[PDB]
Amino acid sequence: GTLIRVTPEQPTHAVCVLGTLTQLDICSSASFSINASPGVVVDIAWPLDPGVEVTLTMKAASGSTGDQKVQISYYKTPPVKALLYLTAVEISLCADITRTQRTWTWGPCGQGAILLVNCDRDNLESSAMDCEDDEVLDSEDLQDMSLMTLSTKTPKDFFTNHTLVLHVARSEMDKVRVFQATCSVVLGPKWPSHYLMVPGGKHNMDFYVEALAFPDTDFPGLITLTISLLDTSNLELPEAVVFQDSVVFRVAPWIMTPNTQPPQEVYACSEDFLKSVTTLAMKAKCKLTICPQWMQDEMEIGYIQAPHKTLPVVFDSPRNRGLKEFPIKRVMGPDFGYVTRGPQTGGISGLDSFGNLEVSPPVTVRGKEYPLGRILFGDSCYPSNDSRQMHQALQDFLSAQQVQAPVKLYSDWLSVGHVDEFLSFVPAPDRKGFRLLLASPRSCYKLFQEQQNEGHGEALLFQQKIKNILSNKTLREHNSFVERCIDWNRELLKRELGLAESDIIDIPQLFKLKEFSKAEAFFPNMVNMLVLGKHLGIPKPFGPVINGRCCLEEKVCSLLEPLGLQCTFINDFFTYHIRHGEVHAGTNVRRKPFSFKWWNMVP
Amino acid sequence: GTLIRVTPEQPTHAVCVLGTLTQLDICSSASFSINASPGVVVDIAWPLDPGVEVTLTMKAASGSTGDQKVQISYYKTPPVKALLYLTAVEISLCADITRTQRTWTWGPCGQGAILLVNCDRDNLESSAMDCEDDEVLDSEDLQDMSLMTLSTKTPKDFFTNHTLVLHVARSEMDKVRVFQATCSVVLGPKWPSHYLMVPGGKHNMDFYVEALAFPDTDFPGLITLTISLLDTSNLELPEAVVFQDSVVFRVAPWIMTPNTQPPQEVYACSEDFLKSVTTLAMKAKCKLTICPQWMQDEMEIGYIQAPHKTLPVVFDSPRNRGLKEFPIKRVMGPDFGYVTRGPQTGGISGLDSFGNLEVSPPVTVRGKEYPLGRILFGDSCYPSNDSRQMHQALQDFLSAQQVQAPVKLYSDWLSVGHVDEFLSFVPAPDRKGFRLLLASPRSCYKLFQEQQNEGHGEALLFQQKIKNILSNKTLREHNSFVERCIDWNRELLKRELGLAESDIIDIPQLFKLKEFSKAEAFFPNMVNMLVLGKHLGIPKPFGPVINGRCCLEEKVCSLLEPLGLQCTFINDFFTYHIRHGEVHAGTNVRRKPFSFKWWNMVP
Ligand SMILES: [Ca+2]
Ligand SMILES: [Ca+2]
Ligand SMILES: [Ca+2]
Ligand SMILES: [Ca+2]
Ligand SMILES: [Ca+2]
Ligand SMILES: [Ca+2]
Ligand SMILES: [Ca+2]
Ligand SMILES: [Ca+2]
Ligand SMILES: [Ca+2]
Ligand SMILES: [Ca+2]
């Protein structure tokens, strides 16, 4: 908004940007009438009372300075004319604010452009994320960036006495970079403002914007870019600002992908195990990449999305065991982004591994819908000197991507400590579209007791007989405490995901307590499975054999077959189980991103 | 929520905390009926279909373990009884959540206790904020803290096999401390969890909680304290959690105090100037403290408030000139809190001085009400190599106190750079309850021109004559650019405070451009005034003398008299004006805090 003050002493000269509101102070220097050239529209809510509001609007840009005029006449005495020469310009900075009112808003009916972190590597043969320099080295790189467009409509000579400057706050320049195209940098970590070399008349200049940081504890994730129109007419004074406009970009969050999303690519380490996963992949329709152990624990493949582009992004875990380089060389690349968090030289724990990191399927909870589901990750029930957690920097980061609003589950009771070890999700053809698989000691005691009741108490696990497993009073106590622990999470998941019992399938699974009374799988942990659509790669439990078949496998089939799930039991025993993890821990999946556009959520 | 599983194999034993929801899984091990002792109420929404929900509620705490029982009978065959022995306890952690549903919410109808930073010094003769140690050294200190209360109702022997532990996340322990009273620490930066020594029966233990950090960029300002009930019955297993409850405190923000709040105490430095402010104070009803120059620029007196207590808190500016120690020795003390921000060894600017920091009066803006008004502070219109700003750490801090939602105004055009130099607010007996005073070159040219018209063009400012001031073409150009700058802010303030023109009074004030074309006051800056209720201490302009009186003083009186304001013109010329500041820059005020409770705002 602007208030021009006019005077009989002499004429006023002023610019009006189309779309702003220009009022007029007629009273300050001195009844009155107003007449203006045809291009000016004087609405006028005359007596010389200062409560009278007089606005001026223009419809077309001027073709020449002082193009349009307003004449205010003051009247017992003869008239006194105060003159005002106006020049109208179009000054509009444009973005994709309708995601295909200078505030960013969530929702299908909100407004605000979207910006991707340029955290992938389109560059020829380098090893750096594209955004860690001040150059656009490849044409393909521009697809990842967001287009912003300055449009001006001015007289041929306007920029004789005006300059436009594009700028970002100092607090946000470390998070964004802006290239101008005919590509060179105009804004970035080094430069917060830049004078545009614009010609008079009708012009358009394209800018390409990338982000350099994902939202975090210290970054809500909004970047503001402003254009300012400056009067540089009087050579003995500074620039005076005449008009300021600006777009607000929101930095796209890193988004995770539940087991219910159609798989696209599988990952593992390098013999018979390797072959069975390679059969599942080929059935699941996805391509396969291999590495020459715990491919689950070191990385998590998410994605970032915007109306113009969407690409997968690896979340490299701060645990830095043998697979440490795999995310930065093999996965990162063209349309494959990269993020990491946490201390990299050491200072982590086992809950920092990404088998401790999962997402739920889309869910609705006492009204609040979570279209991308909710990150699940494990920790203790309270902090003590013995208790473990995922590092605060990872928790903080997942929360700052506000979209899959994380839930803390209880995993510290397990030796290894991964939510993976007691839970999985699977597709289902009805009811919310999935099932929760929770590991269940109750279920396996039931199954074994029924087996001994039907006469098979001499049947051998692995070698232990059913009769002995059930009579073992310590095994039972251990598995009761483990039931308490899993049950605590059952109810967490129930509350935080809005699940009912009919959303949940118990899978027979027995546990044992070992070092520091932490829990480990008594036989191969079936819930630690690889979900490749409806083709499931479950660990071979090597269960009691009744009627020419493992009664364990049989029970799971009874449970998952009627959901249209096809169970394959992979042998991972000497290769994986005895080393504290299973099929799910020896693998990873790239899955299809949600169709639902994260920015349409109202978190 | 809890789901107890009952079995014919043998009786189940379980605790139920009053106020939780206990359901029953009758189907897992195996028509049926339920009968329970009188203390249990079985609502029951029978056939043995697993879709049948069976909850149990208790009304009184048990007097002894397994006090209450539920008997589930299974029935062609004769009955099979599964038994369940329940023990009910009261476990309730209490706070002042109704500020005189385990989420903190803003508003007159929301919920959540409030926590003060213990940033004052009640301690005898020390020099440290109370909260920088793990001791409560004085009884008086407990008034600043918030009371939390654990109530238990259990059988005399319950804590034979259960322990309660109080805890805070590791991410929040550095921001809170908790003392237990009969006072010693149980939680804090060192300790995230603690085992409570509670006796069976009916007990209550008081805790006293203080906060150690104000909300900031890295602290939204919520602290969560949780109690956990742990079963420690089986000596060969870890503790199993049975019940978790928790209160959420919000850390009270630092709140600033507009010129419209009744003054309580004035501050200055040590001759005739000093005496005139001492007359104004004594009329304004407030006490006076003095220091043996720019008392405005180094500190800002705000306050923190909670239902139990409210105290003033100094905001010591990172500029560290001669007055650097004044906030930490003279102001800080009993019921006088302390905060600071920004780099303290150097790395600041003049916009960092707190004459660059003001608040508006309470205001409403296109619907959104701001009951505590809005922080105003100055910066440039865009960032260049020459432009100045208030340090990001100060801006970040003021914004994180979400309450007086800051507005950036344009002050970098002034030499010194303070919003103080072009604006003040004053009480008014009508219309929103105040006036905005903006400095106005327009007004003074008008006044002088009218004076020369009425024959006084030989009248002497200071020595310059009116005739010459008006004929001076450079003075005029300078004052036009300065008008552009003040006008830019007029409209900012109009938009961001919802002001209309009738909220604003122009005060005649002429400026000159000097070093680097920055602006300074041509004569004593009248808008830089000390507002002590309705008693105003304005700088003596030493204006042209007409009719035995400065026509400048006269104009201001014409302007402020009819608002019931009493102008006193203090001479600060050789003492203050010639050193780049005025009365407002040579002073400070403690003012009465808003009656409106900040937590009732919906920011
Ligand atoms: Ca680049
Ligand atoms: Ca790229
Ligand atoms: Ca890594
Ligand atoms: Ca790309
Ligand atoms: Ca994972
Ligand atoms: Ca203390
Ligand atoms: Ca205290
Ligand atoms: Ca200081
Ligand atoms: Ca106190
Ligand atoms: Ca101030």
Tab-separated table of C-alpha atoms in Angstrom, chain B residues 75-312:
chain	number	residue	atom	x	y	z
B	75	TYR	CA	-19.487	-73.436	28.588
B	76	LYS	CA	-22.627	-79.513	26.070
B	77	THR	CA	-19.754	-79.922	28.627
B	78	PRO	CA	-19.471	-78.821	32.305
B	79	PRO	CA	-17.963	-75.396	33.270
B	80	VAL	CA	-14.284	-74.399	33.115
B	81	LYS	CA	-13.284	-71.469	35.329
B	82	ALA	CA	-10.466	-69.095	34.348
B	83	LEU	CA	-9.540	-66.854	37.254
B	84	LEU	CA	-8.121	-63.319	37.353
B	85	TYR	CA	-6.902	-61.507	40.465
B	86	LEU	CA	-6.848	-57.706	40.127
B	87	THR	CA	-5.177	-55.062	42.249
B	88	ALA	CA	-6.311	-51.480	41.699
B	89	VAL	CA	-4.103	-48.440	42.413
B	90	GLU	CA	-4.376	-44.647	42.108
B	91	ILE	CA	-1.396	-43.239	40.217
B	92	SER	CA	-1.842	-39.581	39.326
B	93	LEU	CA	0.740	-36.968	38.517
B	94	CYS	CA	-0.848	-33.462	38.939
B	95	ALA	CA	0.064	-29.918	37.869
B	96	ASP	CA	-1.788	-26.655	37.384
B	97	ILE	CA	-3.127	-27.736	33.950
B	98	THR	CA	-6.083	-25.322	34.264
B	99	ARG	CA	-3.754	-22.373	34.811
B	100	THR	CA	-5.028	-21.312	38.219
B	101	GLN	CA	-5.728	-33.616	27.150
B	102	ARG	CA	-2.032	-34.594	27.744
B	103	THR	CA	-1.119	-32.039	25.058
B	104	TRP	CA	-0.436	-28.332	25.705
B	105	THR	CA	-2.989	-26.000	24.136
B	106	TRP	CA	-3.189	-22.226	23.816
B	107	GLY	CA	-6.358	-20.368	24.781
B	108	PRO	CA	-8.932	-19.492	27.479
B	109	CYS	CA	-10.323	-23.040	26.939
B	110	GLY	CA	-7.049	-24.932	26.618
B	111	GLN	CA	-5.004	-26.956	29.084
B	112	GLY	CA	-1.366	-27.279	30.213
B	113	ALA	CA	0.715	-26.142	33.196
B	114	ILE	CA	3.190	-23.264	32.968
B	115	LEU	CA	6.855	-23.140	33.926
B	116	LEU	CA	9.066	-20.088	34.565
B	117	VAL	CA	12.756	-19.919	33.791
B	118	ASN	CA	14.425	-19.364	37.179
B	119	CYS	CA	16.447	-16.525	35.752
B	120	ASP	CA	16.345	-14.249	38.824
B	121	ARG	CA	18.679	-14.097	41.904
B	122	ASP	CA	16.901	-14.607	45.229
B	123	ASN	CA	20.201	-15.899	46.747
B	124	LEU	CA	21.648	-13.942	49.670
B	125	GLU	CA	24.775	-12.258	48.265
B	126	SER	CA	25.761	-14.322	45.146
B	127	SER	CA	25.852	-13.197	41.444
B	128	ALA	CA	24.451	-16.233	39.588
B	129	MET	CA	20.900	-16.834	38.321
B	130	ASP	CA	19.252	-19.286	40.793
B	131	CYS	CA	18.875	-22.052	38.142
B	132	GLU	CA	22.590	-22.419	37.282
B	133	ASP	CA	23.079	-24.940	40.189
B	134	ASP	CA	21.371	-28.128	41.495
B	135	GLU	CA	20.260	-26.670	44.889
B	136	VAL	CA	17.293	-24.619	46.216
B	137	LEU	CA	19.173	-22.413	48.668
B	138	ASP	CA	16.337	-20.144	49.869
B	139	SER	CA	12.677	-20.825	50.758
B	140	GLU	CA	11.633	-17.807	48.703
B	141	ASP	CA	12.983	-19.465	45.543
B	142	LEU	CA	10.123	-22.025	45.617
B	143	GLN	CA	7.593	-19.298	44.720
B	144	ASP	CA	9.171	-18.964	41.286
B	145	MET	CA	8.846	-22.690	40.698
B	146	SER	CA	5.844	-24.790	39.640
B	147	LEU	CA	4.301	-27.436	41.922
B	148	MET	CA	3.741	-31.008	40.660
B	149	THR	CA	2.126	-33.643	42.888
B	150	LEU	CA	2.178	-37.474	42.762
B	151	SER	CA	-0.754	-39.132	44.499
B	152	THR	CA	-0.863	-42.777	45.161
B	153	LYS	CA	-3.413	-45.002	46.797
B	154	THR	CA	-2.142	-48.593	47.069
B	155	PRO	CA	-2.090	-51.500	49.509
B	156	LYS	CA	0.542	-51.252	52.262
B	157	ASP	CA	2.782	-53.753	50.412
B	158	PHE	CA	2.371	-52.772	46.725
B	159	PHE	CA	5.900	-51.288	46.405
B	160	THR	CA	7.374	-54.586	47.418
B	161	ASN	CA	6.843	-55.582	43.784
B	162	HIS	CA	6.371	-52.226	41.974
B	163	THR	CA	8.556	-49.134	41.622
B	164	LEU	CA	7.631	-45.739	40.239
B	165	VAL	CA	10.164	-43.763	38.239
B	166	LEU	CA	9.918	-40.088	37.320
B	167	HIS	CA	11.724	-39.051	34.089
B	168	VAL	CA	12.253	-36.528	31.192
B	169	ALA	CA	13.497	-37.142	27.680
B	170	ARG	CA	17.300	-36.799	27.262
B	171	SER	CA	16.496	-34.052	24.714
B	172	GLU	CA	14.778	-31.958	27.418
B	173	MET	CA	16.819	-32.620	30.639
B	174	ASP	CA	19.206	-29.715	29.903
B	175	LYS	CA	16.119	-27.405	30.143
B	176	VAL	CA	14.410	-28.332	33.429
B	177	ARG	CA	15.164	-29.252	37.056
B	178	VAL	CA	12.896	-31.054	39.527
B	179	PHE	CA	13.230	-31.017	43.303
B	180	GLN	CA	11.394	-33.380	45.641
B	181	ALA	CA	10.098	-32.002	48.966
B	182	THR	CA	9.320	-33.566	52.423
B	183	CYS	CA	14.428	-30.186	48.790
B	184	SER	CA	16.882	-32.236	46.738
B	185	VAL	CA	17.227	-32.778	42.952
B	186	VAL	CA	15.715	-35.818	41.270
B	187	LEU	CA	15.765	-34.614	37.638
B	188	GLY	CA	17.886	-32.208	35.694
B	189	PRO	CA	20.691	-31.746	33.172
B	190	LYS	CA	22.642	-34.444	34.952
B	191	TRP	CA	19.755	-36.881	35.707
B	192	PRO	CA	16.986	-37.862	33.231
B	193	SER	CA	15.289	-40.417	35.555
B	194	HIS	CA	14.938	-41.280	39.238
B	195	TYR	CA	13.390	-44.024	41.342
B	196	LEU	CA	10.913	-42.626	43.866
B	197	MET	CA	10.911	-43.934	47.368
B	198	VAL	CA	7.208	-44.201	47.941
B	199	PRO	CA	5.406	-46.048	50.729
B	200	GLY	CA	2.280	-48.134	50.214
B	201	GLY	CA	-1.105	-46.810	51.322
B	202	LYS	CA	-2.189	-43.228	50.732
B	203	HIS	CA	0.747	-40.928	49.907
B	204	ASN	CA	1.482	-37.575	48.264
B	205	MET	CA	4.863	-36.234	47.141
B	206	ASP	CA	5.388	-32.638	46.124
B	207	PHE	CA	7.864	-31.683	43.425
B	208	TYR	CA	9.144	-28.298	42.528
B	209	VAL	CA	10.021	-27.714	38.899
B	210	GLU	CA	11.996	-24.835	37.341
B	211	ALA	CA	13.023	-24.196	33.721
B	212	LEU	CA	16.588	-23.430	32.601
B	213	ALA	CA	16.031	-22.010	29.108
B	214	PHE	CA	13.579	-19.755	27.397
B	215	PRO	CA	12.002	-20.915	24.199
B	216	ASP	CA	14.354	-20.395	21.256
B	217	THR	CA	14.998	-21.579	17.651
B	218	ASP	CA	16.065	-24.941	19.041
B	219	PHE	CA	13.405	-25.153	21.822
B	220	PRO	CA	9.688	-24.813	21.065
B	221	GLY	CA	9.379	-24.474	24.829
B	222	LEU	CA	7.506	-27.584	26.052
B	223	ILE	CA	8.877	-29.840	28.794
B	224	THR	CA	7.375	-33.283	29.393
B	225	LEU	CA	7.655	-35.024	32.731
B	226	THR	CA	6.485	-38.647	33.017
B	227	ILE	CA	5.921	-41.071	35.848
B	228	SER	CA	6.223	-44.788	35.010
B	229	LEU	CA	4.915	-47.670	37.144
B	230	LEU	CA	7.181	-50.691	36.902
B	231	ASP	CA	6.623	-54.298	37.874
B	232	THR	CA	9.777	-55.517	39.612
B	233	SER	CA	8.272	-58.724	40.936
B	234	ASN	CA	10.255	-61.349	39.039
B	235	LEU	CA	13.877	-61.189	40.089
B	236	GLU	CA	15.147	-63.012	36.985
B	237	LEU	CA	13.820	-60.425	34.507
B	238	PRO	CA	13.888	-56.714	33.882
B	239	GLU	CA	11.297	-54.306	34.949
B	240	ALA	CA	8.159	-54.349	32.814
B	241	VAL	CA	6.224	-51.086	32.433
B	242	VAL	CA	2.604	-51.277	33.513
B	243	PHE	CA	1.437	-47.631	33.446
B	244	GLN	CA	2.813	-44.344	32.170
B	245	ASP	CA	1.406	-40.886	32.852
B	246	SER	CA	2.723	-37.401	32.271
B	247	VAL	CA	2.176	-33.648	32.544
B	248	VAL	CA	3.306	-31.151	29.850
B	249	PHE	CA	4.632	-27.796	30.998
B	250	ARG	CA	5.130	-24.866	28.656
B	251	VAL	CA	7.997	-22.556	29.365
B	252	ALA	CA	6.701	-18.957	29.892
B	253	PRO	CA	7.945	-16.519	27.203
B	254	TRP	CA	9.818	-13.236	27.820
B	255	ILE	CA	7.344	-10.501	27.319
B	256	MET	CA	7.901	-6.826	26.482
B	257	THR	CA	6.019	-3.778	27.704
B	258	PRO	CA	4.691	-0.947	25.550
B	259	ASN	CA	4.758	2.780	26.427
B	260	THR	CA	1.023	2.522	27.219
B	261	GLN	CA	1.512	0.389	30.295
B	262	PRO	CA	1.600	2.309	33.567
B	263	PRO	CA	5.232	3.032	34.414
B	264	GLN	CA	6.730	1.773	37.728
B	265	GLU	CA	10.496	2.673	37.732
B	266	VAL	CA	12.846	4.931	35.683
B	267	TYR	CA	16.580	4.614	34.844
B	268	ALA	CA	19.364	7.041	33.861
B	269	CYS	CA	23.030	8.019	34.147
B	270	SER	CA	24.775	10.784	36.121
B	271	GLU	CA	22.983	17.296	35.851
B	272	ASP	CA	20.033	19.610	35.024
B	273	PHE	CA	18.845	16.813	32.693
B	274	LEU	CA	18.937	14.405	35.614
B	275	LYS	CA	16.760	16.776	37.700
B	276	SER	CA	13.964	17.166	35.121
B	277	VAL	CA	13.556	13.387	34.670
B	278	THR	CA	13.462	13.168	38.518
B	279	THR	CA	10.490	15.595	38.514
B	280	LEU	CA	8.654	13.518	35.843
B	281	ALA	CA	9.200	10.295	37.773
B	282	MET	CA	7.893	11.759	41.019
B	283	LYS	CA	4.755	12.964	39.183
B	284	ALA	CA	4.372	9.627	37.377
B	285	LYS	CA	4.311	7.880	40.791
B	286	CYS	CA	7.356	5.709	40.030
B	287	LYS	CA	10.574	5.197	41.945
B	288	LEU	CA	13.888	6.196	40.407
B	289	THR	CA	17.267	4.474	40.042
B	290	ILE	CA	20.426	6.113	38.681
B	291	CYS	CA	23.859	4.976	37.515
B	292	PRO	CA	27.246	6.784	37.996
B	293	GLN	CA	25.130	7.400	29.158
B	294	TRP	CA	22.545	5.747	26.829
B	295	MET	CA	20.540	3.813	29.454
B	296	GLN	CA	17.951	2.943	26.777
B	297	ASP	CA	20.359	1.243	24.433
B	298	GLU	CA	21.831	-1.495	26.656
B	299	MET	CA	18.850	-3.180	28.341
B	300	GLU	CA	15.117	-3.897	27.998
B	301	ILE	CA	12.889	-4.672	30.917
B	302	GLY	CA	10.289	-7.251	30.190
B	303	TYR	CA	8.531	-9.839	32.290
B	304	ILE	CA	7.620	-13.487	32.647
B	305	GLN	CA	4.320	-14.665	34.094
B	306	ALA	CA	2.543	-17.758	35.316
B	307	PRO	CA	-0.624	-18.263	37.473
B	308	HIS	CA	1.621	-18.658	40.553
B	309	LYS	CA	4.048	-15.845	39.894
B	310	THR	CA	5.219	-13.145	37.629
B	311	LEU	CA	8.435	-11.207	37.726
B	312	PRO	CA	10.320	-8.622	35.643
